[PDB]
Amino acid sequence: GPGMGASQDDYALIHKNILHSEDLLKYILETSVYPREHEQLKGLREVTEKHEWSSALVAADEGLFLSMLLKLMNAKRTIEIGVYTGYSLLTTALALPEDGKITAIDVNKSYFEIGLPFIQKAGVEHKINFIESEALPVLDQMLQEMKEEDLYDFAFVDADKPNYANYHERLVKLVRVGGAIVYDNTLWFGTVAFPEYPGLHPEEEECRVSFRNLNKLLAADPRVEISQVSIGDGLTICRRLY
Amino acid sequence: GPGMGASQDDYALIHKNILHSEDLLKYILETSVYPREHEQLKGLREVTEKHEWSSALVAADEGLFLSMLLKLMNAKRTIEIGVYTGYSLLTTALALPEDGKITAIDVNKSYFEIGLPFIQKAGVEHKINFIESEALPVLDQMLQEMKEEDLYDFAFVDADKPNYANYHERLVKLVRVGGAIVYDNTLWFGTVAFPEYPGLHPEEEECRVSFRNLNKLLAADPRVEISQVSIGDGLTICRRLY
Ligand SMILES: Nc1ncnc2c1ncn2[C@@H]1O[C@H](CSCC[C@H](N)C(=O)O)[C@@H](O)[C@H]1O
Numbered sequence: 001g002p003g004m005g006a007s008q009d010d011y012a013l014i015h016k017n018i019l020h021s022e023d024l025l026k027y028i029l030e031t032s033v034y035p036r037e038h039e040q041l042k043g044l045r046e047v048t049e050k051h052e053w054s055s056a057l058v059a060a061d062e063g064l065f066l067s068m069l070l071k072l073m074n075a076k077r078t079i080e081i082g083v084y085t086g087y088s089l090l091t092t093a094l095a096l097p098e099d100g101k102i103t104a105i106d107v108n109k110s111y112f113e114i115g116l117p118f119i120q121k122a123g124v125e126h127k128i129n130f131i132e133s134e135a136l137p138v139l140d141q142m143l144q145e146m147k148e149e150d151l152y153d154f155a156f157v158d159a160d161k162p163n164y165a166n167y168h169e170r171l172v173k174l175v176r177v178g179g180a181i182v183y184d185n186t187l188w189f190g191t192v193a194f195p196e197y198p199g200l201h202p203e204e205e206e207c208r209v210s211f212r213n214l215n216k217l218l219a220a221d222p223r224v225e226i227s228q229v230s231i232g233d234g235l236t237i238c239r240r241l242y
Numbered sequence: 243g244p245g246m247g248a249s250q251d252d253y254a255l256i257h258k259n260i261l262h263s264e265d266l267l268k269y270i271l272e273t274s275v276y277p278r279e280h281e282q283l284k285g286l287r288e289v290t291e292k293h294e295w296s297s298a299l300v301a302a303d304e305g306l307f308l309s310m311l312l313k314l315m316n317a318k319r320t321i322e323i324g325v326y327t328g329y330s331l332l333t334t335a336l337a338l339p340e341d342g343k344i345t346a347i348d349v350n351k352s353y354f355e356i357g358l359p360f361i362q363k364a365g366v367e368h369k370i371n372f373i374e375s376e377a378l379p380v381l382d383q384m385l386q387e388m389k390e391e392d393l394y395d396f397a398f399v400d401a402d403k404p405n406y407a408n409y410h411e412r413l414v415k416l417v418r419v420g421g422a423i424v425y426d427n428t429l430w431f432g433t434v435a436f437p438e439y440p441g442l443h444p445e446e447e448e449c450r451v452s453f454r455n456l457n458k459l460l461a462a463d464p465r466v467e468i469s470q471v472s473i474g475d476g477l478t479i480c481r482r483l484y
Pocket residue numbers: 056057058081082083084085086087088089105106107108111133134135136158159160
């Protein structure tokens with residue numbers, strides 16, 4: 001409608017955690033994450049923590065885990081769907097080798113412009129091709145243009161959660177055999193464990209439903225092998241088998 | 243501990259979880275783990291769940307994650323410290339290529355023999371060189387014989403938890419540059435988040451203190467990059483930089 005959309009202040013889940021206690025998550029961040037966090041990632045996180053959609057920001061411990069995965073698999077060409085202010089994007093660009101290439105897709109370039117100065121200061125702007133667009137049309141055009149030699153090593157999916165199953169049908173063809181697709185937020189604040197969950201915002205309830213469907217679909221999908229990981233808000237790593 | 247020491251019934255922490263919802267952990271297992279668990283892994287887990295040291299068994303969602311890491315990094319030669327009934331060992335042997343090789347070290351061969359029939363029926367016993375011994379003498383001899391061309395790609399450390407920092411000093415020389423060292427249980431039931439934690443068996447208290455010291459050590463160690471991951475009982479992935 002012409003009015004203002006829902007704000008995260010209208011959401012019921014934003015103060016929820018999947019870990020046992022706030023103290024345990026704080027321990028992980030202070031002990032194992034902040035001492036290992038790039039100065040420009042720390043700056044980007046601190047600005048984003050103030051932003052109207054801060055609850056969408058990828059967790060910082062999850063960021064270091066994505067970095068580790070990219071380095072262990074020697075990824076060099078990646079795609080990111082859902083950029084926001086650029087925390088996972090800057091994480092990825094810092095992790096890739098100097099000639100690494102990232103295709104980054106978001107509908108909102110104004111969000112990306114918040115993180116862009118941090119990306120520039122980190123020296124990794126040259127690795128990023130930012131596409132201001134809804135992701136599905138971009139992915140569908142890639143299916144017509146891209147050749148086998150151009151396939152992606154790694155995909156991070158963190159945009160509009162109800163569309164994940166649709167993204168999957170494209171990305172399992174756009175990531176190479178043996179490549180990885182990582183879907184963020186697949187435990188959705190712990191709500192996926194319940195067939196009914198009271199008092200959610202309609203937009204939060206739509207994601208509870210879509211993630212329960214997606215988690216079943218990925219578990220049954222013979223094109224990939226999976227690992228669901230209780231880090232951050234949950235993520236699911238998919239490895240393409242054929 | 244399972245190696246030696248007090249019995250499991252003497253411990254306080256065995257039923258505690260790092261996730262705040264038992265429903266959520268069951269959801270992950272029922273949705274994303276059991277449908278993807280090898281038949282022989284299922285049988286080995288079911289017998290081990292009845293064993294007197296069942297609390298030491300690696301979590302099954304953690305197992306799929308270790309498998310994913312091994313495949314994405316194209317591991318071919320690995321070392322395991324702490325075998326118990328062999329769940330992580332079988333997971334690793336199933337993940338590796340057909341000519342992959344595992345060095346498996348445990349003080350108690352009788353535990354390994356509980357799992358061996360499942361490993362044999364899975365057809366991957368041939369990848370495993372089991373060494374019945376304390377781990378520290380084995381690693382010290384390996385530093386005596388190890389050639390650069392034979393460095394391990396991957397190490398899983400899951401044995402006697404107070405010795406991890408000692409294991410680390412050898413493993414950062416026995417794993418290749420860019421190889422991974424994974425330390426299991428680094429969140430120790432969540433107790434690491436507290437400077438004091440009443441109500442623990444003395445062996446459990448010793449691990450709380452040792453993991454608190456280890457987590458600081460790894461976060462400050464310039465020889466590796468790290469990611470601490472809140473899966474299972476917590477684990478820390480280390481990547482050797484030089
Ligand atoms: N259909 C769509 N196509 C592309 N981007 C979309 C989209 N729908 C929503 N988005 C974008 O997806 C982003 C999700 S938040 C992304 C978080 C970010 N990856 C981080 O590391 O913090 C938002 O910026 C939103 O604008």
